[PDB]
Amino acid sequence: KVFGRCELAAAMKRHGLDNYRGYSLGNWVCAAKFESNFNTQATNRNTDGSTDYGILQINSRWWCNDGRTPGSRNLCNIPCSALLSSDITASVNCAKKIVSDGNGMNAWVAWRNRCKGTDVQAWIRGCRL
Ligand SMILES: [Pt+2]
Ligand SMILES: [Pt+2]
């Protein structure tokens, strides 16, 4: 599923991400834009042989099992294919673990390089939230 911008803002807000660990909703919307283009089916291989999955590009090195990342962890206790559903619940729940691990949103490279320090409230402009 390719979300619209305000559609995704409303789903993320409903699932408790607005101000989660102090990160406003716009930071999450901005991260999803630049990680996946709002596409729940997005997959991208990493150099180490891991893969990032879903609307928030969660990495099989640590967070999910994809059957082809040997020696990795599964800290969200899920198959990585759960992160590709039209339903973002599994991605949101896993993201809450990630952001709480001490590194905050800096785990998302696209957030760090494209969102951090910018006017992220623009990402929720015009939405009825
Ligand atoms: Pt939820
Ligand atoms: Pt660790």
From Swiss-Prot:
UniProt-listed Pfam families: Lys (PF00062)
Enzyme class (EC, first level): hydrolase
Residue numbers binding substrate: 101
InterPro entries: Glyco_hydro_22, Glyco_hydro_22_CS, Glyco_hydro_22_lys, Lysozyme-like_dom_sf
Assigned EC number: 3.2.1.17
Domain of life: Eukaryota
Principal cellular location given in the protein's record: secreted
Domain C-type lysozyme per the UniProt entry, residue ranges: 1-129
Subcellular location: Secreted
Tissue: In the egg white and polymorphonuclear leukocytes.
GO function terms (MF aspect): beta-N-acetylglucosaminidase activity; identical protein binding; lysozyme activity
GO biological process: cell wall macromolecule catabolic process; defense response to bacterium; defense response to Gram-negative bacterium; defense response to Gram-positive bacterium; killing of cells of another organism
Keywords assigned: Allergen, Antimicrobial, Bacteriolytic enzyme, Disulfide bond, Glycosidase, Hydrolase, Secreted, Signal
Keyword Signal: yes
Catalysed reactions, semicolon-separated: Hydrolysis of (1->4)-beta-linkages between N-acetylmuramic acid and N-acetyl-D-glucosamine residues in a peptidoglycan and between N-acetyl-D-glucosamine residues in chitodextrins
Cellular-component GO terms for this entry: cytoplasm; endoplasmic reticulum; extracellular space
Active site: 35, 52
Subunit and partners: Monomer.
Function: Lysozymes have primarily a bacteriolytic function; those in tissues and body fluids are associated with the monocyte-macrophage system and enhance the activity of immunoagents. Has bacteriolytic activity against M.luteus.
Other observations noted: Lysozyme C is capable of both hydrolysis and transglycosylation; it also shows a slight esterase activity. It acts rapidly on both peptide-substituted and unsubstituted peptidoglycan, and slowly on chitin oligosaccharides.
Protein name: Lysozyme C
Organism: Gallus gallus (Chicken)
Name of encoding gene: LYZ
